[model samples]
Target: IKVVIEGKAEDLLEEMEKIKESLSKFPEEKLKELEKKGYKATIVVKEDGTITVYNELTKEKHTLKKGKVTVEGKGEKKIELPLLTAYKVASDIVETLRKGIEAGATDASITLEYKDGKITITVKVGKLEKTLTVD
Candidate 1:
């Protein structure tokens, strides 16, 4: 599964950080397990700190209010990390995008891919492309 975010470089960076912060709330292992089970979850954080998790594989979506994980489906469960642990991919992506933008790119895009048990992040800015993988 994959999540793609595209827009102005600055806005893109802000969205990326939002995602990173949201993912930081849960355990890294749990998120990895979801990906390993063929379920890729896209976590969205609202301005008011409301978090919503969307599963790309099952098309199931849920919300996370405060520290509670609310399940939208029958028995579906959703899953985050510390400083640079689970969210390292996000951090790296942000860094890549920043570098690309600083190099003169006006627009940027970052993609998060979950395959097997690895997380792959690809950042594209203008003609510059960088890929980072986390196991």
Candidate 2:
């Protein structure tokens, strides 16, 4: 029965933790590019649930994570997001993307795949490609 799952939870957690730490220090200069309209970017998600979203405009500094929900700018401490909350955040992101597509995105395609011990979602629309992963 355990074989049904691809990898050990500990390994997944460790990998995700490293990705999280990397996200915490995202740079700001690139983020400035995303603030405006008319641009393209690609989002990548690793098997360990680490995500990297980048576009010609915005940088990694302006990224989103499936952890504890924090209000932007106002500033609140982020104390480890719960696993359940993490899944919920993923769901919300997918749903929002779906809605966006429904509203009229050009040449949009979303691909979900899992291999080895990881899951990845690739969303492509116009000049933008976003990928999400979880392990």
Candidate 3:
């Protein structure tokens, strides 16, 4: 079963993690440009128990819903990621991943796609341009 939920405020990824962990849902993915007051995404749970989430603002590689109550980024999430923005995107990712798995997506894809191994979340915002000089 897959579901997408939305919310507002200072992109509650850190706080939402608590719920995502409990509900086993991924933050939803949305970019409507509708001047939305809030954000959203989906959560996907596969039959095999693999889960995936799509984060627009930040990239959350993989999170252990049942394995570990607490989640830590498996690897680097890219230096370009801003703390506030990351929290926002990560929150969305939590929602999206939850939906996909719920919808029966045994495996999913995005900026990157792997088999049974590797981080299920592949958040591809776009090319990261290097800043030649700091403003």
Candidate 4:
């Protein structure tokens, strides 16, 4: 059975960590298949200036991100980490991070476009103000 979850974008890496270590795990061949097969979260700019998280790989889409302002203007930008795609488990990597940015992310990197003809979670950061993805 599958259950939906919601949370902030800043906790993406950490969220995936818990889901992987807890309900799922690495080295999972089955999970890997789902990932590489085209499981992705897309940020399509809406007419309302909000970012919608669409599961490009699957039809499973999460919440629409209405980004917030950085009150302190103090962000914690982390180095770019390579988040590979593997469909073995739930493949929550993209969705988790998607929610993160919507919830006022702090620091991270996400690649906005295609990678090797496949959509992988390449670049993203919580400190991002916003992006006009469709354009």
Q: For candidate 4, write residues 1-135 as lDDT tens digits.
A: 111222334544554444334323335564456455545433343333333344443344343332331111122211111113223222445454656566777555433332243333333455443232221
Local error of candidate 2 at residue 35 (angstroms) = 35
lDDT of 1: 0.58
Candidate 2 to truth, TM = 0.29
lDDT of 2 at 122: 55
Tell me which residue pairs clash in candidate 1. Answer: 26-80
Instruction: Give me the candidate number with maximum TM-score.
Output: 1
lDDT string, candidate 2, 16-78, tens digits: 344344333434343333333344333344333444444333233323343322122222212
* Segments of candidate 1 deviating more than 4 angstroms: 19-83
Candidate 1 lDDT tens digits, 76-117: 222322223445667677778788888888887666555575
In the order shown, what is each candidate's alpha-carbon RMSD?
A: 10.2, 16.2, 14.9, 12.1
Stretches of candidate 2 exceeding 4 Å from the true structure: 1-104
Candidate 2 Cα lDDT to native:
0.37
> Residue 18 in candidate 2 has what lDDT?
43
Q: What count of clashes does model 4 give?
A: 23
Assess each prediction's global lDDT (C-alpha) against the native: 0.58, 0.37, 0.34, 0.37
User: TM-score of every model?
Assistant: 0.51, 0.29, 0.27, 0.30
